[PDB]
Amino acid sequence: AASHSNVVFPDMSGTALSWVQKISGGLGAFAIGAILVLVVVTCIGLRR
Amino acid sequence: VGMSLLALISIFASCYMLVAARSKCLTPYALTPGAAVPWTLGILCCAPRAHA
Known part of the structure; x- marks a missing residue:
């Protein structure tokens, strides 16, 4: 029988979740930049 | 209670x-x-958010 406790979920620094972190961070940066663009444009529209 | 009450006095006075x-x-x-x-x-x- 096993000498471990059957824990399978990997670490956040592991290769799989590191790759997922990179991808999610890229998409989040894209969303943040788009939000900033919309905020600037709508504030300029309001200020007129 | 004393420290909390002084903190509330500070925050209310500043905001006011x-x-x-x-x-x-x-x-x-x-x-x-x-x-x-x-x-x-x-x-x-x-x-006035938008008017005047």
Whole structure:
């Protein structure tokens, strides 16, 4: 029988979740930049 | 209880005194049929969001 406790979920620094972190961070940066663009444009529209 | 009550006094007094500063800075503009100068409005919010 096993000498471990059957824990399978990997670490956040592991290769799989590191790759997922990179991808999610890229998409989040894209969303943040788009939000900033919309905020600037709508504030300029309001200020007129 | 003493420390908490002093903290509440500090925060209420500060927030109230900011409100007083806001009203004093913005008071002359409510006595003329003039513009709100969006440069002032953006930094310093007011009750009229869009009108006047």
